[PDB]
Coordinates of C-alpha atoms (C1' of nucleotides) in Angstrom, one line a residue:
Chain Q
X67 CA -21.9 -14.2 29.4
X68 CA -22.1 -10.8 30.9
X69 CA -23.7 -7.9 28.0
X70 CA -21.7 -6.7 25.2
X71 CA -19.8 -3.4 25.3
X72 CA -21.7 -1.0 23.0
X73 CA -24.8 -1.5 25.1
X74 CA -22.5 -1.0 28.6
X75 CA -21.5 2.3 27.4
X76 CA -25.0 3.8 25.8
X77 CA -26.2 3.4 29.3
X78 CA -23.9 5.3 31.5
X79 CA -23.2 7.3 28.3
X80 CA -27.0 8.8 28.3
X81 CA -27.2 8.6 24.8
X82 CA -28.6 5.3 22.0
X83 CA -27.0 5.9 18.9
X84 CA -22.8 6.8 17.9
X85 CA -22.3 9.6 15.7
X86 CA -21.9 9.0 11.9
X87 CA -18.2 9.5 12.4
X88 CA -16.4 8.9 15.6
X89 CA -13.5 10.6 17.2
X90 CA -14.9 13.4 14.8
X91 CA -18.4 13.3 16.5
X92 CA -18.6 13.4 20.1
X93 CA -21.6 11.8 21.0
X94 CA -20.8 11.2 24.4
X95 CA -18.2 11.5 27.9
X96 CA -17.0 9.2 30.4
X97 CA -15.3 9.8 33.3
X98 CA -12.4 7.3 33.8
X99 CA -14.2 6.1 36.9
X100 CA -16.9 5.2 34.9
X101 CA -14.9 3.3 32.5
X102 CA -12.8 1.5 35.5
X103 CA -16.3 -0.1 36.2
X104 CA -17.2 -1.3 33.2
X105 CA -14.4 -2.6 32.7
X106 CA -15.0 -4.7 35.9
X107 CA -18.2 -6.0 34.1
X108 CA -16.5 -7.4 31.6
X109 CA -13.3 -9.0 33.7
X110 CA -14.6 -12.4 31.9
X111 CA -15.0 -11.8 28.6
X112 CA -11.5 -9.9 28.4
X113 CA -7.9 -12.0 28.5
X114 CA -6.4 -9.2 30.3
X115 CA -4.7 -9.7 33.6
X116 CA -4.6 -6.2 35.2
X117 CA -7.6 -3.7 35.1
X118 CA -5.1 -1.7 33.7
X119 CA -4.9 -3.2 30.3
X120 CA -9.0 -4.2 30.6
X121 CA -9.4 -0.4 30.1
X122 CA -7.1 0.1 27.3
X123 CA -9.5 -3.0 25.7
X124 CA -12.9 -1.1 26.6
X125 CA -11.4 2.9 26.0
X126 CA -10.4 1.2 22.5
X127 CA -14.6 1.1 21.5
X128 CA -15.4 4.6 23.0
X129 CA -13.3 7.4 20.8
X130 CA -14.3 5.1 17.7
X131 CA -17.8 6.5 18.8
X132 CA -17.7 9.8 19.5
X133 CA -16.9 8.8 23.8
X134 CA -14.7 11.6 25.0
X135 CA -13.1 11.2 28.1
X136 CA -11.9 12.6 31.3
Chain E
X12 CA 21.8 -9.3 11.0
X13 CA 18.2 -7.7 11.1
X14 CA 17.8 -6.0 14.8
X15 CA 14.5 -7.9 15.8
X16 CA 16.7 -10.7 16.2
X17 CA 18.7 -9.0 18.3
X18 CA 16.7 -7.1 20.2
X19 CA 15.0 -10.8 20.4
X20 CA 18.1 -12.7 21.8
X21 CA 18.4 -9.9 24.4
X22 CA 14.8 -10.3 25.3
X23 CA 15.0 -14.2 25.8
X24 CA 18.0 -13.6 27.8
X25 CA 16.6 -11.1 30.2
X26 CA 13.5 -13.9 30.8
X27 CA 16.2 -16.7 31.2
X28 CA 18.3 -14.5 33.6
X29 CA 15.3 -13.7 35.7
X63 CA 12.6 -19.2 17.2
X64 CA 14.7 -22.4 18.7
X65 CA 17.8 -20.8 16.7
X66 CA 17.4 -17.8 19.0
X67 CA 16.3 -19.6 22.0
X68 CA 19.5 -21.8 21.4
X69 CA 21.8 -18.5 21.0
X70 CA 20.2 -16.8 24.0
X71 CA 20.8 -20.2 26.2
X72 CA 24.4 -20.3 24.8
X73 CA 25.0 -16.6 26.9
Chain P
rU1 C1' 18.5 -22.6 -24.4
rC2 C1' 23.4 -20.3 -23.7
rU3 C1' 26.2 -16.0 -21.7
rC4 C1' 27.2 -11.2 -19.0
rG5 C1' 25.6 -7.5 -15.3
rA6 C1' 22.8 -4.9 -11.0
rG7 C1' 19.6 -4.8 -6.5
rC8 C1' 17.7 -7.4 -2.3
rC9 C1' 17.1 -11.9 1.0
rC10 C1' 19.8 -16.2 3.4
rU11 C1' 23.0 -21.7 8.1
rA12 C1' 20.5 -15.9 13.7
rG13 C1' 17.9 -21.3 8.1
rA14 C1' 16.4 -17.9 3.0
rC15 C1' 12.6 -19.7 -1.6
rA16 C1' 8.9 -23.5 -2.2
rG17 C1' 6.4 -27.5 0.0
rC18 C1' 4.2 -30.2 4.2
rC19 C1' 2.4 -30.3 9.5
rG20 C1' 0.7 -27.2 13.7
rG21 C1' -1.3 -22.2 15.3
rG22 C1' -4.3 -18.5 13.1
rA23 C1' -6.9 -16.5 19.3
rG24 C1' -10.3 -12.6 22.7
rG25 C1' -12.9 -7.4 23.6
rU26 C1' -16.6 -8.0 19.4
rG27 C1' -21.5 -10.7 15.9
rA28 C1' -16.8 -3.1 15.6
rG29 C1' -20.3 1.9 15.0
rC30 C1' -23.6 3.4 11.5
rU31 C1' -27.5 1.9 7.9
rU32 C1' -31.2 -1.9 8.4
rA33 C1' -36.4 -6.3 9.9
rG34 C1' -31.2 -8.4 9.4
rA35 C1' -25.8 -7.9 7.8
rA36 C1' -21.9 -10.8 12.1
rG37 C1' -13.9 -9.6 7.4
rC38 C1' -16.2 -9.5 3.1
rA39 C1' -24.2 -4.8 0.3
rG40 C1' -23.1 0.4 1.5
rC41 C1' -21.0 4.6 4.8
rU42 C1' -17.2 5.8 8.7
rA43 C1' -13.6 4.5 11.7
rC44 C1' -9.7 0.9 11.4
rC45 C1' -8.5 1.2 17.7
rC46 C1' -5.9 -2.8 22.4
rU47 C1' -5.4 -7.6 25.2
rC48 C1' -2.9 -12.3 25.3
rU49 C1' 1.5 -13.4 22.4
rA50 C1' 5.9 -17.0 19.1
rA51 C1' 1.8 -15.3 15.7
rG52 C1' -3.2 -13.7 14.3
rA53 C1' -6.6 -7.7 9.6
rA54 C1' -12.2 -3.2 12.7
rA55 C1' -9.9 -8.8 7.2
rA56 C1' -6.8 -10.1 0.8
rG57 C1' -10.1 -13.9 -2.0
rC58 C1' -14.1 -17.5 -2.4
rG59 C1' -18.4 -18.9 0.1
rU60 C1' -24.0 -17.9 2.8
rA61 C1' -30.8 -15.5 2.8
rA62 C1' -27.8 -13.8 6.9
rC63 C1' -24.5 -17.5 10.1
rA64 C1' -21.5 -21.7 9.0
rG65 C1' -17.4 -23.2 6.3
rC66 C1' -12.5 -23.0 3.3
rU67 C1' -8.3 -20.3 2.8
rU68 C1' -4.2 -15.1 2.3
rA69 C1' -2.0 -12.7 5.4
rC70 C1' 0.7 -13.0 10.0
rC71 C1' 3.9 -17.1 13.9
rG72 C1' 6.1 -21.7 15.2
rG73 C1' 8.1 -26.7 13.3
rC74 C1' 10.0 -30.2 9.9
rC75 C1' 13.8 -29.5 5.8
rG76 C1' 18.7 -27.7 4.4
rA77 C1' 21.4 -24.1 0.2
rG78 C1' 21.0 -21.1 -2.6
rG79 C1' 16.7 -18.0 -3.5
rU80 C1' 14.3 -13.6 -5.6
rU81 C1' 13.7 -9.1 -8.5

RNA sequence: UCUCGAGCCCUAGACAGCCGGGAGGUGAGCUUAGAAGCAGCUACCCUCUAAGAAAAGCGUAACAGCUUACCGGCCGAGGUU
């Protein structure tokens, strides 16, 4: 149903492409606001039952990319 | 005796409170 | 094929076999027209849970599909190095 997360993140992110090596490359930031919505985007697609663990889910795709947070 | 069994057992037991082998050896406390 | 010894596992059910489960974010990011476990490069994280890899081997033009891991059941006595 609702988009995929890469695409979810590029757009808040400001940014199109990860870095050739994540956690090494930051790329990009994201507030935990911002992640606390996508994650409400996506309270379909994941199993979890608290928005809690729905982050822990979507702030697992980000530092493999190069998405800082804070 | 390995401890994930244990630590098993005790966590069955703290759901009942509140494997079959361990299930059956929880229920038995 | 006979005999002697050591280590580890096992009735909290071992070894093997058979049955059932092997799931979501997500077909990871990059590269690329495309690549979705499985061309290559990098990373390899967390939910549900009794389990279930950013996938060990085949398979596909790429999917699909078939299995290993991993978990549960049936079984019941030694098994393995």
């Amino acid at each position: 149903g609702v988009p995929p997360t890469a695409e979810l993140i590029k757009d808040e992110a400001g940014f199109e492409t990860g870095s050739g090596e994540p956690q090494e490359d930051f790329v990009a930031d994201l507030s935990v606001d911002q992640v606390k919505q996508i994650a409400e985007q996506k309270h379909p697609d994941l199993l979890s039952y608290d928005l809690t663990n729905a982050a822990k889910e979507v702030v697992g795709t980000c530092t493999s990319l190069g998405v800082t947070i804070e | 005796i390995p401890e994930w069994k244990q630590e098993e057992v005790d966590a069955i037991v703290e759901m009942i409170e509140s494997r079959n082998t361990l299930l059956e050896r929880a229920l038995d406390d």
